[PDB]
Amino acid sequence: AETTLFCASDHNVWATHACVPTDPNPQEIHLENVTEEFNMWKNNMVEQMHTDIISLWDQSLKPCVKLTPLCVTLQCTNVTNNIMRGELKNCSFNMTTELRDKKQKVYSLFYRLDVVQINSNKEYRLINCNTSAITQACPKVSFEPIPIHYCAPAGFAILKCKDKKFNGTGPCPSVSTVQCTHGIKPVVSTQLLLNGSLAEEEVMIRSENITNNAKNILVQFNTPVQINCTRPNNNTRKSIRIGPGQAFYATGDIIGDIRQAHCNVSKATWNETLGKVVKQLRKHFGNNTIIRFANSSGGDLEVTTHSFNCGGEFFYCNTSGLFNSTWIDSITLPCRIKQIINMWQRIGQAMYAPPIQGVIRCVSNITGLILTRDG
Amino acid sequence: MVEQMHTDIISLWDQSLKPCVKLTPLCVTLQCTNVTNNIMRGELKNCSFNMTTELRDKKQKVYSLFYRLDVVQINSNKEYRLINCNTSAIT
Amino acid sequence: TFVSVAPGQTARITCGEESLGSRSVIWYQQRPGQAPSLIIYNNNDRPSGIPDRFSGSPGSTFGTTATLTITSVEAGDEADYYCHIWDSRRPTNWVFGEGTTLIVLS
Amino acid sequence: QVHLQESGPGLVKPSETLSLTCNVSGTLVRDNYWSWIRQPLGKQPEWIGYVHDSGDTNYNPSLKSRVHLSLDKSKNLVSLRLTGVTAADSAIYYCATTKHGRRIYGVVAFKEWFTYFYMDVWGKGTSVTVSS
Amino acid sequence: QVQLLQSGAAVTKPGASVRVSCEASGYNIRDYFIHWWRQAPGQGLQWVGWINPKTGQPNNPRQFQGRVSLTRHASWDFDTYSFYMDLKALRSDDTAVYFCARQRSDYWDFDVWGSGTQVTV
Ligand SMILES: *[C@@H]1O[C@H](CO)[C@@H](O[C@@H]2O[C@H](CO)[C@@H](O[C@@H]3O[C@H](CO[C@H]4O[C@H](CO)[C@@H](O)[C@H](O)[C@@H]4O)[C@@H](O)[C@H](O[C@H]4O[C@H](CO)[C@@H](O)[C@H](O)[C@@H]4O[C@H]4O[C@H](CO)[C@@H](O)[C@H](O)[C@@H]4O[C@H]4O[C@H](CO)[C@@H](O)[C@H](O)[C@@H]4O)[C@@H]3O)[C@H](O)[C@H]2NC(C)=O)[C@H](O)[C@H]1NC(C)=O
Ligand SMILES: *[C@@H]1O[C@H](CO)[C@@H](O[C@@H]2O[C@H](CO)[C@@H](O[C@@H]3O[C@H](CO[C@H]4O[C@H](CO)[C@@H](O)[C@H](O)[C@@H]4O)[C@@H](O)[C@H](O[C@H]4O[C@H](CO)[C@@H](O)[C@H](O)[C@@H]4O)[C@@H]3O)[C@H](O)[C@H]2NC(C)=O)[C@H](O)[C@H]1NC(C)=O
Ligand SMILES: *[C@@H]1O[C@H](CO)[C@@H](O[C@@H]2O[C@H](CO)[C@@H](O[C@@H]3O[C@H](CO)[C@@H](O)[C@H](O[C@H]4O[C@H](CO)[C@@H](O)[C@H](O)[C@@H]4O)[C@@H]3O)[C@H](O)[C@H]2NC(C)=O)[C@H](O)[C@H]1NC(C)=O
Ligand SMILES: *[C@@H]1O[C@H](CO)[C@@H](O[C@@H]2O[C@H](CO)[C@@H](O[C@@H]3O[C@H](CO)[C@@H](O)[C@H](O)[C@H]3NC(C)=O)[C@H](O)[C@H]2NC(C)=O)[C@H](O)[C@H]1NC(C)=O
Ligand SMILES: *[C@@H]1O[C@H](CO)[C@@H](O[C@@H]2O[C@H](CO)[C@@H](O)[C@H](O)[C@H]2NC(C)=O)[C@H](O)[C@H]1NC(C)=O
Ligand SMILES: *[C@@H]1O[C@H](CO)[C@@H](O[C@@H]2O[C@H](CO)[C@@H](O)[C@H](O)[C@H]2NC(C)=O)[C@H](O)[C@H]1NC(C)=O
Ligand SMILES: *[C@@H]1O[C@H](CO)[C@@H](O[C@@H]2O[C@H](CO)[C@@H](O)[C@H](O)[C@H]2NC(C)=O)[C@H](O)[C@H]1NC(C)=O
Ligand SMILES: *[C@@H]1O[C@H](CO)[C@@H](O)[C@H](O)[C@H]1NC(C)=O
Ligand SMILES: *[C@@H]1O[C@H](CO)[C@@H](O)[C@H](O)[C@H]1NC(C)=O
Ligand SMILES: *[C@@H]1O[C@H](CO)[C@@H](O)[C@H](O)[C@H]1NC(C)=O
Ligand SMILES: *[C@@H]1O[C@H](CO)[C@@H](O)[C@H](O)[C@H]1NC(C)=O
Ligand SMILES: *[C@@H]1O[C@H](CO)[C@@H](O)[C@H](O)[C@H]1NC(C)=O
Ligand SMILES: *[C@@H]1O[C@H](CO)[C@@H](O)[C@H](O)[C@H]1NC(C)=O
Ligand SMILES: *[C@@H]1O[C@H](CO)[C@@H](O)[C@H](O)[C@H]1NC(C)=O
Ligand SMILES: *[C@@H]1O[C@H](CO)[C@@H](O)[C@H](O)[C@H]1NC(C)=O
Ligand SMILES: *[C@@H]1O[C@H](CO)[C@@H](O)[C@H](O)[C@H]1NC(C)=O
Ligand SMILES: *[C@@H]1O[C@H](CO)[C@@H](O)[C@H](O)[C@H]1NC(C)=O
Ligand SMILES: *[C@@H]1O[C@H](CO)[C@@H](O)[C@H](O)[C@H]1NC(C)=O
Fold first, then answer.
1. Selecting from 3.30.750.24, 2.60.40.10, 3.40.50.2300, 2.40.37.20, what CATH number does the domain E1-121 have?
2. Which residues pair with A162 in a beta bridge?
3. Contact of A196 with A219, CB cutoff 8 Å
4. Is A131 touching ligand 18 by the criterion CB < 6 Å?
């Protein structure tokens, strides 16, 4: 059956304060002798969680500032630097003040991915002006994934399959009953599952059909690969009052050197992690195949790069060096930050992540991949 | 019961203000003279401003008596603005 | 700038503009009537023969002007003091800084 | 002990190619970098350019299009031939053994570094002046 | 109704590039991958590759790696969806008719195809 699962948990986007207090010691009842037929690819819990995450993202953005005024022609020069590195543009514009009959000449550092050139060669505009309306994310609500336990109502139950080697579907012996799922962090990302739950026995390959290319191959790691980010720019913020009781937090001067952001992955671990992955893939594809790993074929920035949210800033890491081997000391992946983010593949609901002050760092754990085979 | 009543009163105040007019245009520079009086009693200011009309491409010169507590002086000595323009939006 | 310090004191000679990024300022001393000479490169590293009294402000700080501190000033230290700033966030500076004539009251 | 002795005419006609040379002893011209430094009287020194044999040659952008530096091994000379001489070129010209160093402030793979050139032992100086 | 309007036949030379457009309309373009196929003269069909309309992620076989480029462009509100197929190192071998079809389930049922575009080199 399918029901409305509610949340349970121990200033956040996913409204975790509103959740029911979870049981300090969850009660798990190992059911004996019972075999149940699972199917992870027709799970209604997944679609319901997708709807819940989208709804929470929408409700967190409801009371925040609307940056409709910010869509104007911007006189952009390069940030003061010697050096490509056009990655930051010092853009000046006439913003509306608290008084409707006055205007102020203000400036802001905008990433190059957030501004497109119009026409006069110095005139720019935000990327979203010709497709969407932009809503500044509130500076006080955090994007940090807090674990969420999905509990079913009374009269329903959740069946956890404890079988370590779970292909994903079909009959699973050693079933158990739980009142809530484990803490599932809502971590949005592409090309790599971060801060996830790990397999216990082996690396696990799970695809709806391993013959259909359109179906992604979810890889789960038995051991995590630690990934360390830094946004080395200091990036102070600055409030510009765009209207009565409405502020716009814009990047000001950078305190230090203009350095490319990145995330590092250990080479000796990521190799032999791909070793386990190629062993488990050769299980499905025969022993004589040559399991090559190439980088992203193309598409949007959200799927050509390992996209994610780190320290409140939205990173897009190249990961061309990760997915490099034939398979018969760190790997610095350069990442680009964006502030105009269109989550959930939508249009009309873009948002402006305010600039974070200081220096951001990730310490995440790659616990899987989302691969795609070439036909 | 006291905290719940506080929440209820605030929520009712919010919901009663939800469908009403937003005076975002009213935050502008106001040319304020004293109301016609002999007489302190600066308690009322006759303030004139260019308000938006029904048509977005037209403007109207209108006036209004504003209490002195509701207007602060900017800068030109006759130029004023509503007290809330630099801190809040008024409904 | 004509910063004058009596001998045996500590002299502070600042030069250049406010730091923007990671900087490697190179200090030069020009005694009157001879060619310039090197004192500090990479903000604190002196070649052989230069005494340890010469010290430079770190280039790892942003928002601080380049300074040269000279402890126990002597008549040898009587000279003009130029700075060659190499900022990461500025183009190459092809002219030295405005020199400061240190005057020893001896 | 590296000895540098710069030789020049001492006076040059305006609009005529000034030329200088830097006799070197104790070191070979091919080994290290070589820079010239033009100090106008009463003004700060100016870095007019540096030259190397591997291909590293860079001159001041203001003095560019009128300057050329050459390294002659046969006589151990550094020749600076500043065409288009004008009134402001009156100055003391020095010759120096430039030494380079890398200031690294980030990831070297991302080219987050730069080469700073500090001038080691100089010469003496030739005070070239321009007049009719 | 569901329609995949293709572009007119184009002529190029060996080395030049060709673009084939597949303006799609009449349905939710997002939920259905768009596949490109190639009918050589007097031969069977050949799989050029699919493009995801949501993310834009392309997928081509080993033959067309570094050679073909599947792109898309959605107008306002995603109502229209122009799918482009680009070729770079074009040869006389690649003279064929390029069809664009709509995969409509996991079975790879291409219930709708394009009119066709005769690329002659
Ligand atoms: C992912 O992995 C990659 C690697 O694969 C990581 O990449 C690294 O990124 C680092 C920056 O984030 C970068 O760090 C720098 O390295 C420089 C070189 O250090 C090495 O060489 C020098 C000799 O040249 C050795 O001494 C040293 O031991 C190393 O071998 C340093 O120059 C940098 O430190 C200096 O600058 C920074 C930036 O401002 C300062 O914070 C720091 O304090 C240092 O500044 C002092 O020292 C310099 C010396 O040149 C002076 O010029 C300066 O004025 C300062 O002076 C003080 O200290 C000196 C001490 O000598 C003293 O005399 C003076 O009085 C002052 O007290 C900087 O540390 C790595 O090199 C780079 N690694 C690579 C590419 O291999 C990446 O970060 C990782 N990402 C993550 C973790 O997310
Ligand atoms: C601000 O940014 C500028 C660039 O905009 C930096 O100036 C550059 O500095 C680098 C490093 O010194 C220079 O690169 C060097 O150039 C040589 C290549 O040829 C040059 O000269 C010819 C003739 O004029 C030109 O055609 C050509 O374009 C180049 O200008 C090489 O010889 C050098 O190689 C060095 O490194 C290798 C490392 O393997 C060594 O083996 C070599 O021996 C040698 O040391 C080097 O690549 C570059 O030319 C400069 N550009 C300009 C425009 O001046 C500044 O350093 C930077 N300043 C800061 C941060 O203060
Ligand atoms: C995967 O999980 C890891 C943790 O397991 C996570 O890294 C963590 O990121 C958070 C981001 O919030 C870091 O917490 C921040 O750390 C610094 C230093 O204390 C502070 O700047 C932050 O506090 C300020 O900002 C907060 C909003 O971000 C405000 O709520 C707060 O009041 C302050 O203004 C904040 O504490 C945390 O330190 C790291 N963990 C580490 C380094 O171990 C990572 O981001 C996750 N990855 C993904 C993709 O989700
Ligand atoms: C997957 O890895 C590929 C390499 O294996 C990357 O391909 C590289 O992409 C670069 C950026 O598009 C190309 O640089 C461009 O080259 C063209 C042709 O010479 C120039 O016109 C462009 O100016 C130049 N771009 C810039 C910014 O200067 C590289 O040439 C190209 N390398 C190869 C070997 O083809 C893919 O980009 C990469 N894909 C992803 C999604 O990361
Ligand atoms: C971005 O550009 C602005 C100008 O649009 C810079 O602000 C100026 O900075 C200079 C140099 O310090 C000052 O003399 C001016 O008074 C500033 N003008 C202003 C604030 O209107 C600003 O420094 C630049 N920011 C960067 C490169 O981060
Ligand atoms: C991701 O990184 C790769 C390299 O790891 C980039 O490919 C390089 O592109 C530059 C030009 O930008 C070329 O000069 C190099 O030769 C390329 N390297 C290789 C190994 O092919 C790639 O461009 C990066 N991705 C993006 C989207 O920029
Ligand atoms: C407030 O000031 C307005 C003008 O801004 C006054 O209106 C004017 O009154 C005089 C005298 O009766 C008339 O001749 C003008 O035609 C009026 N002008 C208008 C309506 O634009 C108004 O009387 C003042 N109100 C007070 C003191 O209450
Ligand atoms: C500004 O950046 C552009 C790249 O966007 C670059 O081509 C140009 O040379 C830069 N201009 C200056 C004056 O630095
Ligand atoms: C801001 O307004 C002034 C009015 O004089 C105009 O000159 C300037 O170009 C405007 N700037 C922008 C970015 O539109
Ligand atoms: C797991 O699922 C796949 C799905 O294709 C099925 O074919 C396979 O037999 C299952 N394997 C095991 C070991 O249960
Ligand atoms: C960022 O800049 C602030 C001043 O704006 C400074 O205090 C702080 O130390 C810097 N952060 C670093 C170096 O991480
Ligand atoms: C990640 O960061 C931590 C920070 O302490 C460091 O100890 C660890 O070695 C890093 N791992 C990698 C793979 O860079
Ligand atoms: C990874 O390990 C394999 C197996 O030992 C080895 O052949 C290969 O060179 C290593 N490196 C890469 C990049 O695959
Ligand atoms: C990708 O692999 C090639 C060899 O196939 C190698 O030369 C290249 O440097 C690699 N690129 C990376 C790690 O970015
Ligand atoms: C992976 O990283 C998190 C911190 O980001 C850490 O708490 C967790 O224990 C790590 N996982 C494993 C299996 O060590
Ligand atoms: C108007 O009122 C002010 C006080 O706000 C008073 O000082 C001033 O004299 C008055 N002017 C006239 C013309 O009545
Ligand atoms: C109203 O607009 C007119 C336009 O001529 C101007 O002269 C007058 O000062 C404006 N009044 C205010 C209060 O801004
Ligand atoms: C919006 O602007 C971009 C950049 O100019 C352009 O390519 C695109 O066609 C426009 N329309 C939409 C719907 O994105």
1. 2.60.40.10
2. none
3. no
4. yes
What is the distance between the alpha carbons of residues A102 and A242, in angstroms, rounded to a whole number? Answer: 11
Data resolution in angstroms:
3.0
DSSP secondary structure of A256-274: S----EEEEE-HHHHHHHH
Angle at A155 between CA A151 and CA A157, to 5 degrees: 45
The Cα–Cα gap between A296 and A304 comes to: 5
When CB atoms are compared, the residue of D61, D105, D122 closest to C36 is: D122
CATH numeric code, C1-104: 2.60.40.10
- Of C40, C15, C11, the closest CA to residue C27 belongs to C40
Q: Could you tell me if B89 lies within 8 Å of chain A, comparing CB atoms?
A: yes
Residue of E55, E57, E39, E28 lying closest to E98 (CA atoms): E39
**8 A C-beta contact, residue C37 and residue C103:** no
Q: How was this structure determined?
A: cryo-EM
- Domain D1-132 falls under CATH 3.30.750.24: no
Q: Please state, in angstroms and rounded to a whole number, the distance separating the CA atoms of residues A108 and A355.
A: 11
Domains of chain C, residue spans: 1-104
**Cα distance between residue A26 and residue A196, in whole Å:** 20
Residue E78 has its nearest CB partner, among A208, A296, A347, at A347
Query: In sequence order, which residues have a C-beta less than 8 Å from that of residue D52 and are 6 or more positions away?
Result: D33, D34, D71
Q: Where are chain D's structural domains? A: 1-132
